[PDB]
Design an enzyme around this catalytic site. Sequence first.
Site, PDB file in Angstrom:
ATOM      1  N   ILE A  69       0.853  -1.230   0.000  1.00 10.50           N
ATOM      2  CA  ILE A  69       0.000   0.000   0.000  1.00 10.50           C
ATOM      3  C   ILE A  69       0.875   1.261   0.000  1.00 10.50           C
ATOM      4  O   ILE A  69       0.299   2.361  -0.112  1.00 10.50           O
ATOM      5  CB  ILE A  69      -0.989   0.000   1.185  1.00 10.50           C
ATOM      6  CG1 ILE A  69      -0.283  -0.059   2.543  1.00 10.50           C
ATOM      7  CG2 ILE A  69      -2.007  -1.120   1.024  1.00 10.50           C
ATOM      8  CD1 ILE A  69      -1.210   0.112   3.727  1.00 10.50           C
ATOM      9  N   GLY A  80      11.793   1.937   2.812  1.00 11.17           N
ATOM     10  CA  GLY A  80      11.328   0.551   2.622  1.00 11.17           C
ATOM     11  C   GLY A  80       9.961   0.515   1.965  1.00 11.17           C
ATOM     12  O   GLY A  80       9.785   1.189   0.930  1.00 11.17           O
ATOM     13  N   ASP A 111       7.949  17.222   7.341  1.00 12.32           N
ATOM     14  CA  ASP A 111       7.530  16.792   5.978  1.00 12.32           C
ATOM     15  C   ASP A 111       6.000  16.764   5.876  1.00 12.32           C
ATOM     16  O   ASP A 111       5.456  15.742   5.415  1.00 12.32           O
ATOM     17  CB  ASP A 111       8.140  15.437   5.603  1.00 12.32           C
ATOM     18  CG  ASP A 111       8.061  15.109   4.118  1.00 12.32           C
ATOM     19  OD1 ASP A 111       7.883  16.048   3.314  1.00 12.32           O
ATOM     20  OD2 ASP A 111       8.175  13.915   3.775  1.00 12.32           O
TER      21      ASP A 111
HETATM   22  C1  LIG Z   1      -1.221   3.770   2.692  1.00  7.95           C
HETATM   23  C2  LIG Z   1      -1.177   3.820   3.866  1.00  7.95           C
HETATM   24  C3  LIG Z   1      -1.132   3.883   5.295  1.00  7.95           C
HETATM   25  C4  LIG Z   1       0.008   4.404   5.930  1.00  7.95           C
HETATM   26  C5  LIG Z   1       0.122   4.493   7.325  1.00  7.95           C
HETATM   27  C6  LIG Z   1       1.243   5.011   8.153  1.00  7.95           C
HETATM   28  C7  LIG Z   1       2.485   5.399   7.800  1.00  7.95           C
HETATM   29  S1  LIG Z   1       3.029   5.221   6.168  1.00  7.95           S
HETATM   30  C8  LIG Z   1       4.594   5.902   6.523  1.00  7.95           C
HETATM   31  S2  LIG Z   1       5.626   6.013   5.337  1.00  7.95           S
HETATM   32  N1  LIG Z   1       4.710   6.259   7.860  1.00  7.95           N
HETATM   33  C9  LIG Z   1       3.540   6.001   8.654  1.00  7.95           C
HETATM   34  O1  LIG Z   1       3.557   6.291   9.838  1.00  7.95           O
HETATM   35  C10 LIG Z   1      -0.975   4.037   8.073  1.00  7.95           C
HETATM   36  C11 LIG Z   1      -2.118   3.518   7.473  1.00  7.95           C
HETATM   37  C12 LIG Z   1      -2.228   3.430   6.071  1.00  7.95           C
HETATM   38  O2  LIG Z   1      -3.393   2.904   5.565  1.00  7.95           O
HETATM   39  C13 LIG Z   1      -4.075   3.650   4.542  1.00  7.95           C
END
Ligand SMILES: C#Cc1cc(/C=C2\SC(=S)NC2=O)ccc1OC
Length: 343
Positions: free
Chosen positions: A32, A38, A154
């Site tokens: 996703i 990574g 960011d």
């Molecule tokens: C897509 C997605 C997605 C990303 C995150 C959290 C992230 S991604 C990142 S790089 N650092 C985080 O803390 C959390 C949930 C999600 O579901 C849609």
Amino acid sequence: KVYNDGYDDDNYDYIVKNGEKWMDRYEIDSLIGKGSFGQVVKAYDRVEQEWVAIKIIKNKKAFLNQAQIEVRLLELMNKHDTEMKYYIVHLKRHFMFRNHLCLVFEMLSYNLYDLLRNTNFRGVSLNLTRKFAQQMCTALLFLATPELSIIHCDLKPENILLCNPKRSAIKIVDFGSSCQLGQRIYQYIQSRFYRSPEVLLGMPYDLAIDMWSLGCILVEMHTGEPLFSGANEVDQMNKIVEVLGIPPAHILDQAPKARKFFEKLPDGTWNLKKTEYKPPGTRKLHNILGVETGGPGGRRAGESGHTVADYLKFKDLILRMLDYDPKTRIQPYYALQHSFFKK
Ligand SMILES: C#Cc1cc(/C=C2\SC(=S)NC2=O)ccc1OC
């Protein structure tokens, strides 16, 4: 050549396989998210019986150490009792799996960039951006806690995610680039479009840079386009100057990178360097927002909550977040007392 007993590819990234089961608990569905850090996968937690996002940090000492800082910041934020912490992505747990640090976050919905793309970059209602603005202002007030003093570093629409696709509740994600208030150890920081004038001028930066980012984001959420879409730092500064004018002399006299953008005339005043743009401060935010012309591209003509009075409150708050002076730039607590939020 095989890497990490065939678990890793040549770029140190763990080779995600749909249907794979980790430690008789997590079932990997799909990838996703991706980046230099990574990858991120949607996985089902058999124990909690819920969907989670697992951030698989690539098998490298440099990337592991960056992730350790992120885990400490997330765990430090999680420890605070205040319910303002529910505007920040929640790290449920972290573990080492096949020489990869894995951060298990709560599963969320679409980010605000996906939202802007769904509109074909025409932006969302002033009513929705107000709901986003207040949640973001609360989130920045939380990070402003003296014990935390966290700079997200960011902020952009991609890094703001809906909790639920049919609710307007948002959480800030990705603290992988975050620092706490301290010595100006980094200087090339923030995404270009949301980069504060402090960072552009190579001056010391505080938590106010996230507030600059927010100002840039909220305008973008209403109009659909980045307020300042610079192809480079020089173009970025020039597009900021178009809307806000030349930064005050007292700032630029102290700015180490002042002469990357400006030349100091013999009378002590600062002009731009030429190489294309409107005269400084002539692309008024009044016109970008369409305060008196039914909003961006007149697409909000006759919509409820899109009056001249409503737009003037919005414009006032955005201009306070885009104050060049980081010491007078509006702080989260004062932003939350703004008339834009008064029902
Ligand atoms: C897509 C997605 C997605 C990303 C995150 C959290 C992230 S991604 C990142 S790089 N650092 C985080 O803390 C959390 C949930 C999600 O579901 C849609």
